[PDB]
Amino acid sequence: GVIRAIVRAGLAMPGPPLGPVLGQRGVSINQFCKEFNERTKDIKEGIPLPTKILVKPDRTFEIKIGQPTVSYFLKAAAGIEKGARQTGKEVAGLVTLKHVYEIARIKAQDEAFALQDVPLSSVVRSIIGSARSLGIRVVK
Amino acid sequence: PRFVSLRAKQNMIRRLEIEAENHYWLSM
Amino acid sequence: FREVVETTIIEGRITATPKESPNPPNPSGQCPICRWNLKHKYNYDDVLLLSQFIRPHGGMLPRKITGLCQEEHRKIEECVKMAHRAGLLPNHRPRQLNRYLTRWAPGSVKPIYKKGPRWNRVRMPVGSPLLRDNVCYSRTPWKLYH
Amino acid sequence: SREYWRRLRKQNIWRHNRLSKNK
Amino acid sequence: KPKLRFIERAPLVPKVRREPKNLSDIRGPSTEATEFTEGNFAILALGGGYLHWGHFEMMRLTINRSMDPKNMFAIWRVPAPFKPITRKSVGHRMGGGKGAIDHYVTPVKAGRLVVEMGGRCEFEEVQGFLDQVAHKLPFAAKAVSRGTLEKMRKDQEERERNNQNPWTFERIATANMLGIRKVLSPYDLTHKGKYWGKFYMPKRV
Amino acid sequence: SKAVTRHRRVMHFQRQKLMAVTEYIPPKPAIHPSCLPGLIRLLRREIAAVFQDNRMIAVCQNVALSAEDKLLMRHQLRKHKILMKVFPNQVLKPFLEDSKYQNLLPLFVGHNMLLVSEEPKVKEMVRILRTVPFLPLLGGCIDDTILSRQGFINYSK
Amino acid sequence: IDKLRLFTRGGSGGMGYPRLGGEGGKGGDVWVVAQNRMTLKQLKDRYPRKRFVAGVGANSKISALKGSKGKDCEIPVPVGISVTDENGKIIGELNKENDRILVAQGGLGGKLLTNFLPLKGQKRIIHLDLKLIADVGLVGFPNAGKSSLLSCVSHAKPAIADYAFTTLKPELGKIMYSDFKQISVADLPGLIEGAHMNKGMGHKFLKHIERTRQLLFVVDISGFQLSSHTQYRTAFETIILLTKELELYKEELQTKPALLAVNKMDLPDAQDKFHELMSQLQNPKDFLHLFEKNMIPERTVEFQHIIPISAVTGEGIEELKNCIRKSLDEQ
Amino acid sequence: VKQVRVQFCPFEKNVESTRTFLQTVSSEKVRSTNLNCSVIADVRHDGSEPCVDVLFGDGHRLIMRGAHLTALEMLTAFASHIRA
RNA sequence: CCCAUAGUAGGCCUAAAAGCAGCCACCAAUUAAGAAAGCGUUCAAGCUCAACACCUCCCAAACAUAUA
């Protein structure tokens, strides 16, 4: 099977969101937490990062690390840990074109996110749509 | 309850056509 | 046509493909009967038309396999239903009361034991309902309830 | 344009989804 | 309010004078409330009659029993029971006129739309409830969407324009061809051979 | 009797008689019909532009590749410049007729995919077809010259 | 592990129909009695075959005799029973053994030509909630040794238990109260590893374990570097995460008699301050802060206490475990 | 059962049935249903082949030629040979 | 028949509610895939579908084929 984990970089082994989602396939929870912690230490911290987690029937793990969520990166760049209750009537934050372009470049740099479009205008439009889905207003 | 079969259709069709032709020649 | 030779070794070989007649005078029809100029004049006594659409064990042919129109394929199926029970199609065995054109199937037809009043009369099932517009050479109306 | 065609395809998809909503 | 309002048994203002029950108010295909009115699905009355507060209350109970107010809203287009149908004293001498009023009922002819339904819901999901209501309805009806009524009208127009008969009901009747005027109704020129008394024959092409 | 009671209302035999005279007969057919016999233009224009711009166009019958395999093939054809695309076969037949290509008409059949490029980079596709045992390269067209699977293999070698 | 809903049938009346005499049976009552783990020794918790009925009345006709009496029905449970009815609320509120709750309906007769009435037998809608598989559901952490901890803290060997559910039967472990009696606790179904530690032997089984009304949060009471886990999820961090999940799952359940299990105490000693850490985690608001007067980040401050596992020292750990078991069985 | 040769080359007239049989329900798309397949495509000419030659592990061997035989019939023959 | 990836485990509320617990926008990256339409899910994971590759003992007896 294929799982989709969004576990945080800081605390790899939580209670609610760690085991119940995809632990039933059969794997060592402590080993997976240690691998996630090592991957988080290899990268920057202070932001959640999605992982691929390649599981096998022979109980073999191949953890792959992409990048932080574009919504989470946009929230960190805007400076709001809490999003808008009603999008997008209440503009929680304002994102400039330079920060949006930097976030789009960071997202396209990752390979597990599979943002491998030839043009960067498509990635910029995708990041703009992701920001407009949240409470972020594009400036210029 | 009563039903009328194709016999009624043919004889009554003769009736209707007779009346129609009488109407037709009576228009001048 | 194809055969599956088995002995474990199993193979599929295409052998004895059938072919059509050389002179279709009714080309570019939509029913195969319309493709063969048989639009309304096929009858339940017809052995050849029966053989042209009966599977070797008596299976029903789908219209795509049959090449006939869906109304015509239903006509063919009803003709098959007429003819296999007619005792004229012994060529399709799976493993007495004589008949003439019994439509519905025997082993579930209830005994019609309450003959209704002549002003509200139910008659016996008579004839295949599919052939209501069959090509009639007669002037008598074609019966449905005898 | 391709964006207009994608929008029309999305509209048709939403229409068929709303049709299947009763099913 | 996405729910059906309650229909009272009689209005607050009563009917002081006695009145008769004319069958002509239900006879004939109705012209008013015949098409959809801010609705995409409804029940078109396939027959004439009178609906009281009992039939309206049964319909309202069946609607509010199975409806989603966030996706389906239903508004009763028919009025409340207003026509007074009376009943005399039990064990009274026969004849002799009419007594006090018994109960109110509003009369609806053939073709009237009963309850307009709308919102984020199609007629296919509510088709079962509408069919149960129509089988339990006071008069005969048919559950039709916004496009189903148009499909039926187009089919009827096609059937009318594809006629092959050498004689038609109007073709002998409006002509008064063969003395059927000895039996032809005075109002028969209006239904064109389609509405016979309390039954409605739309199936006649 | 009542005008409208529990029983149905009375119909005269004259009334039903004219009603049967009013049998609304539907149309009588003669031959019967049952037994008788914007995106596309834009896609065709894009296909013509891709065929004109690219020097080497290769047609493949590859359908065996999964979504991950298709993504890997797209990554390989993005690393070395080769535009991979697929359009309708009925549209491509009009496109082939407009482009005046005779040998590419019978090659385009079933599931297919075009790879149009200026620099020939079919060696990577050949290596991918070598790694996963399939042979989708058949009937290529490079520098206005129709080739075969053997010709494509010789060119890749 | 789930909750059971049964229909209870009692005695039914008799018949006649003699000129002298009269009717027969009466209507029995529905009794619910909770029993110890010895009731679970006989396999009668996988019983469910659409409930059970009771006897009916008699008539007698030779020569003028009346009939018999009705019959009452008693519904037993393997380990503990919480009894509710169709009124939307429970009358009896207990889970300890030897507790009985009764519902009465009867007074039967017979039809009409000597001494009159019409009816049939009586019934009631009973709801049995066992408050998890046995007494409480244990959700551990990725350091869990709850089976070995229960075996070390009790002289009674754990056995296999079952419950009246539509799913599989979870495993149960016996704990000692040091009072000539023993209590029981329940773990994850099949192989016990702990619900938080990525294991429930099934997704539906994980839902069944998470549906428990009384939850016990097992965690490592020792140091993170000295915990029997590699890599350990830290005692403070994993304890805070599990306690926050349990409290935010239901504020009423956090304010109810729920506890957290102190595990991995077989490495720790009397001087290891494992009991001190358990007390500091139980008396506080499941965080660093001990007491909050007005401004409290949690739903309720000064919550319940913690349960001991793999017992050590002599500062009342056995008494604390017995009190925790009594509070869990109190429900 | 075991590997299949699948002979197909652009020498004679191309067959759409053989191409459909090779590309679909024998190729890597069909490898999910038949996990132990190891299917390969052969470009060696045989002469009006459209072979889709399969050598089973039991020593069965299958030749279904194939130019006039449809893709559906060849796939059904392959399925019948697999089921045996 | 077939095919179903990705920003993404869309955001607020929510332990988590991942398209499917309640709301807001429903954009958008590939030829072409609804910020999700009937399932299933504690949450997930797994099914399809839309969009792309392909095209009182009933009571007549009876008979359909002979030119209104």
Numbering used by the authors:
A (entry chain J): 18 to 157
B (entry chain o): 24 to 51
C (entry chain r): 35 to 41, 47 to 134, 146 to 196
D (entry chain l): 114 to 136
E (entry chain N): 47 to 251
F (entry chain I): 30 to 66, 77 to 196
G (entry chain y): 16 to 346
H (entry chain k): 13 to 96
The authors write:
The human mitochondrial 55S ribosome (mitoribosome) consists of a 28S small ribosomal subunit (mtSSU), formed by a 12S rRNA and 29 mitochondrial ribosomal proteins (MRPs), and the 39S large ribosomal subunit (mtLSU), formed by a 16S rRNA and 50 MRPs. It is specialized to synthesize 13 hydrophobic polypeptides, which are essential for oxidative phosphorylation (OXPHOS), thus playing an essential role in maintaining the mitochondrial function. In this work, we use tagged assembly factors MALSU1 and GTPBP10 as baits for affinity purification to isolate late assembly intermediates of the 39S LSU mitoribosome. After processing, we obtained nine well-defined classes that represent five different folding states of the 16S rRNA with some additional variation regarding AF or tRNA association.
Of the analyzed intermediates, State 1 showed the least mature conformation, characterized by the immature central protuberance and an immature PTC. Yet, besides rRNA helix H75, which forms the L1 stalk, almost the entire domain IV and domain V were still delocalized. Taken together, the presence of DDX28 in state 1 results in the stabilization of the central protuberance in an immature conformation. Situated below the central protuberance and functionally most important in the large ribosomal subunit is the PTC region, which comprises the rRNA helices H90-93 of domain V. In state 1, however, this region is shifted outwards and located right in front of the immature helices H80–88 of domain V. This structural arrangement is stabilized by the methyltransferase MRM3 dimer. Based on secondary structure, we can unambiguously fit MRM3, which positions the active center of methyltransferase domains right on top of the A-loop. Also in state 1, helix H89 of domain V was still located in the vicinity of its mature position, yet shifted outwards and stabilized by GTPBP10. We observed the GTPBP10 bound to the sarcin-ricin-loop (SRL) and the stalk base, which is in agreement with the findings for ObgE, the bacterial homolog of GTPBP10.
